[PDB]
Every structure is written in structure tokens, then in C-alpha cells.
Amino acid sequence: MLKIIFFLLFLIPFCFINNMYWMVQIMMFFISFIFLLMNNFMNYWSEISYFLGCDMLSYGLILLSLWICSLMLLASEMINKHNNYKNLFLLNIIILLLLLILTFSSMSLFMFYLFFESSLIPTLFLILGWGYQPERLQAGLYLLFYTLLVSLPMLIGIFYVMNKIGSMNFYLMNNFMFNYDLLYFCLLCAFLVKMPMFLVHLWLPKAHVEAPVSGSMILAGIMLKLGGYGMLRVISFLQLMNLKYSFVWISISLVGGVLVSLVCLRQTDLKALIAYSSVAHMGIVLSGLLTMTYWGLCGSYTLMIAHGLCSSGLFCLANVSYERLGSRSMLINKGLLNFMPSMTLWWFLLSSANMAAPPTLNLLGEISLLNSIVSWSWISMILLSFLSFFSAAYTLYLYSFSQHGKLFSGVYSFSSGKIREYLLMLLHWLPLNLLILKSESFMLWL
Amino acid sequence: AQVPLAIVSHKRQVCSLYKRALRNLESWYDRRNVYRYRAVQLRARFDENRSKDLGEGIRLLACGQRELFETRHFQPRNFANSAGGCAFEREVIPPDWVLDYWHPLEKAQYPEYFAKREQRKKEFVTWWEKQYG
Amino acid sequence: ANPSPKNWQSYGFDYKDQVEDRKATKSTFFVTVTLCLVWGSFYWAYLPDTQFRNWAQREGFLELRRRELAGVDLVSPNYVDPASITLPSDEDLGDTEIII
């Protein structure tokens, strides 16, 4: 489509006007409402305008991008209270959201690649500009050099596919099939880094911690899903070779999910534990993607949609304790039930959404993902039970130790909870239970 | 404000062993008369033994510690309101500065109490300037 | 007992004046709750058959009405007719990987 793109393009001059910070998120929620209205999509590409079109996977990912960026302007009031550069922050957020909409509504592989690697420069700018740590240089360089080092040979793979086929469109490239090892490694390993593996994760827990709240939303909300969207577009023509080489990645992802779930029990930071928590769920997503079933692909799309909300909502919760208690340390964050009792509703409602929860879309994504992985092999029942047990062994630890117990002595006086924060964590959880209603929307993209 | 000192005397060690032995004896024998009879028996056992020297007292103190570790009850009786009990610190009282973060319309429900708190704030800041200032 | 109107507790949106708090609070609650969560959910409740799942159920009921009347197959196992497809001969294939 072009309406949303030109809406953000004409929302670009809102940044240069003084005292215009809160109108931009109003117009962003308005264009999210308009994007809720334009929902006539089926499994093929619809609303074809030049090189821009949309199917159901692209619809869900653009809607998630708009919701995460609209809440990202709502979460960052620390940028508005200080005289930190609001115009540059708004311009970077609008440009980054426009690049995410352009790389998700891309009809072809190459424009997807171009806006996909254009998206990492505003994330770089947010991490090195608006963070609160001395190691922001260690944060952005790890992210950029990891993704760039594994995504440069993907361009050689992309033009090898173009030279063998002729076209760049997803449907015409779905017809062909390749039997090459190095083409498979080029077109897969960039997404295998962009979603967290066990071995290649390092950029993730050292880039989530040192970023701002907005870097945390944009990294754990939609930029762990660029790799998932890319693998959902690439795996269709590399089925024979991924069936040869998928047991290595699935075994590494499952053992790495168990091991990173064992890491989070030995983590002393709130923002680092959610950073490693993004590794464990996307390990289940990666293990269910390579089985190529209908249920694996549908449950992977459902779990990426339901994870981009819940991980970002958990990252807003660690920010509103970092703003008041002064540190992200888990030892300091103790007994917040007696400090902010009304926040503890949103802590447990968004920590339960990280595990299997009764009304959330995360359970409907996790059920449809464990179906495919148990269907893939019977040996995976040993390590899926361990991973899904350790997931709530660590995820209950963050709510339990931060929101229950004796109070941390020697804490100075801070402000109380605000209606903006309650609204911010309201919109990270009510989409998770209102989307099981009309769940055939957000699951059946095929 | 006397912070306790970590050195423990030998008489303090045997007094602590006597206290823990009678607490274990109270845990083992629930009836008060049988516990009293066994407590007088254990007191006579201590009182026939207090006339020895220091090194023999240290070695037999270690033997008594090993014996008390051997005969320790699996469910020792403890007071509920004290530390380590069944219902210790069931409620946690937050510090009073959150009362300073109430709404003024919420502060209007107890105006005499908040006026007394605002009066006490000046006394506390002069007391802190006297003490640590 | 009578609080001053100048001692006002801010909401989360602005910390400079009371006018920008109320306008941004009411407008942000307008663009999220009564547009994106209630009117949008009312739109998505009465959304038409974008996916053809209702049409699939109606066509399945009509097809199961008509297939068991003919009685050939409730579910057809073959994509095309077995007489229409021209299979290659055994000498034509040679050593080719036949997958089943």
C-alpha cells in the first residue's frame, strides 16, 4: 500500500515543529486504526501498488510494527521531560517505522533486503544516542558488525538466485528449487543471526542492556522478527537442502534454549534476563520453522506476533523500575508490591504472557509450535519438556524476586506510578488476549 | 546502640549448647512434666561436669556439640512470632515517605495526621543536623 | 483540609503545565481505547470472509451432500484423473529417484 507510507512521509515534518511530541503518537495510533480498517487480505499478495503489496504475514508484521512504534513513543517520556533531542528522536522513530513498513510490504527479496539493512542504522542511532550506559559503543558495534558480517554474503546469494531465476518476486522464486550448500548458508545464516541462536546471540544481551527503552522495544519487538520473516520467505525454495541441514540448527536451538533458560536463573539484571528470555522463545520459533509443516509455520508466525508484544511489555516494566530505583540490578529490585502495588498486576500479566498463559496468543503459538517439533522427532519430547519447564522456572523468578519479599533498604524517595505507564502496559497485554478472538487472522497466513 | 561482638567465650559456648540442648529436649518431649524431669536430668548432667579443666572442657564441648547434632529433632519447636518461626514477618511495612507521595485530595482525608507529620519533619531535620550534620 | 488548586499532581504525559496533561491524556485515551480497541474490535468482529473459512464450511457441507449421493469418494485421493495422466515408461525413466 501507499497510504500508510505517504502518511508517515507527511508525518515527517511534525518533528521540526516545537511542542509537537505528543501529536505524533496520536497520529501513529490513528494510522494504526486505519491499518486495522484495511484488512481485506488473503494468503496471496493484495493491494498491489508498484513494488508494494501485502499478504497476511505482512499485514500482521506491519500492524505489530505500528503498534510497537506507537507504544515506543508512549514509553519514552524521559526524552520529553529532559531537553534531549525530541525532533531527532521523532524523526528517527518515523524513519525506522517507515523502513519497517517498507521491508515488510516488499513484494520482492531485494527491496526487503535493502530496507532490512536500512533499518539497522536508526537502531544504531537510538542505541548510541539515547542510552544511559558507558558501553553503548560495545552495544551498537556488536549488533552492526554481527548482522553486517553475516548479511553481506546474503547479497551474493540473492543475486545468484536472481541470475539463476531471472525475477525478484516471492511467488516466481517459490516455483524454483536449489540444491547448493553455500546458497543455503548465505540465504539462511543472516536470518539465523537476526533471530537469536545459541551460538550467534552475543549481540542480543549486550545490545538490549545498554540501549534505551525504545531500543529495547525496537529490538525485542520487531527486529527479532525480520529474520523470521526472511526465513519464511526464503525456506520455500530451499526445502531439499534445509531438510539435509536442519537437524543441526534445530538441535542447536533446542539445547541452546535449555541452556539459555539455565542462564536466566543466574542473571542479576532485569533488562538482561528479558534479553536472554527473547533467546529461548525464538529458539522454539527457529526449531518449529525448519520442520516446514503447516502447523510449524503458522505457530511460528503466531509466536513471533505474540512475542513482539510481551517482550516489549516486559522491557517497559524494567524501565519503570530503572527510572525510580536508579539501577537495573535484581538485588535492588525487591519488594515492589509494597512500592507499586498497582504495577504488580501488569508485571504478572506480562510475565505470565512470556510463559504459557490461559488467555494469551503466546500459548496458541506455543501449542502449534510444539505440535510440529514433537511431530518432527520423538527425541524432542525430552528436551521440549525441559525447555518449557525451565521457561517458567526462570520467568517466574523475575516477577518473584522483583515483586515479592522484603524491601531493599537504603532506597531514596521516588515518584509513584502514572496513568501513562498504566496505559502503556495496558496496550501490551490487551492485544495479547483480544487476538485469540479472530485468531484465524493472525495464524493462517497460508 | 551496642552492635554485638563476634567473639564467643567458652562459657558462652557451653551456655549456648545448654540452651540448644534444652530446646531440642523440649521439641522431643512435648509434655511439660516429662520435659521438666528430663531438663533436671540434663542440668544434673551439666552440674556434675563443670569442675573439669579447660582443654578437657573444650574437647567435651565438641563431643557435646556432636551429640546434639546427632540427636537433633527433624521438626524442632520454635516460636512463631520470632525469627525462623512459622509466621515470621508475614506483613512488610513500607517506609513512611510514600505517605508524602499521596494525592492532596487523598491527603485531605487525614489532615490532622498530615499536619502533625509536617510538624515532625522539622524536628527530624534538626535532629539529623544535630546527629550527623 | 482544603487543598490548593495550584498544588496539582501531574499525569504521566507532561510536567510543565496542567493544560497539556489533560489534552494529551484525553486524546491518547481516545486514539487507543475507543478507536484501536473498541471500534477496531467492532470492525474486526463484523469483518467479511477475507479468508474463505465460512465458504469452505458451506462448500464442504454441499460437497458432502453431493459426493455421497454419487458415492464415489468422500475425499478424492487423486489430484487429477488417473486415465488423463500420461505416466512415463520404465525405459523412459531409467535410473531416476522415485519418491514415496
Binding site: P341, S342, I419, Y422 | P94, L99, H103, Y113 | Q9
Partner: peptide
């Protein structure tokens, strides 16, 4: 009637009424 030391619940109630 001893006065319990509770944090402020005005903002949560105003959020509930606005919602």
C-alpha cells in the same frame, strides 16, 4: 485506629475511571 503506611492509589483509580 492505627494509620497503615500505604502508597498512593489515586493514579490507578483515575486510570481505571478514565479507561
Amino acid at each position: 485506629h492505627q494509620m497503615i503506611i500505604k502508597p498512593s492509589r489515586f493514579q490507578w483509580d483515575k486510570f481505571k475511571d478514565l479507561l
